[PDB]
């Protein structure tokens, strides 16, 4: 769904 992960942005799939 096109999500922008910017620098330093922790991102969790679960």
């Amino acid at each position: 769904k096109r999500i922008h992960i910017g620098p330093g942005r922790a991102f969790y799939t679960t």
Partner: antibody
Amino acid sequence: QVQLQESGPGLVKPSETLSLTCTVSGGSISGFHWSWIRQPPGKGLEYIGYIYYSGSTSYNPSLKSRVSMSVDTSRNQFSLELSSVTAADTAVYYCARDFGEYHYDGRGFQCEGFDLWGQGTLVTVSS
Amino acid sequence: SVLTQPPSVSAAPGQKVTISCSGSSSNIGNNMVSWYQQHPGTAPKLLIYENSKRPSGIPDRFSGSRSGTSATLGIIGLQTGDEAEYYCATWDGSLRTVFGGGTKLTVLS
């Protein structure tokens, strides 16, 4: 505040395996994709691949038959293993933290850049 | 290589310059560009991300833009300290991050 530090052998015999580790401090592996990028002396930069904190990976097709990466969240470290090395693999290796675009279809994570970089470690493939 | 940049650019101190990054539909056309500054002997440093965003610490005289399948790094008010190798990068459909060959910026002295 987050700092990355490479740890490598320095010299490696051709045909043998190159093993590197990156230690993340002042932060954690959790929630990020991590990569290794190398630069032969005087030449350009080459992305090797990325690994998500959970273990999923994606490697540069040009190195897929020789590379693998792993992660150890308990030590906040991730590693690189490059087999059958030759002089073409002589270069400064950097570990880095990634950012980019994530798709919920199949493209998954698309690494567009690196915001945090280790200081780099020179790996020389020679007898 | 997938991304192409002119090998070198130069201008006098106080002047401004631009650095091209030529890509294609498989990379810049679908993904955002990031730029780096590298002083020989040290690691690349993130200058621009998401085509035009500047991280904290990078002065506003550094800018980035993207159009079609190409991108541009602009540097205003050149200072001797700006001399370094500049690289553009992004994700390519071949399933990997690709870097341009790098542009050497010389501040004419």
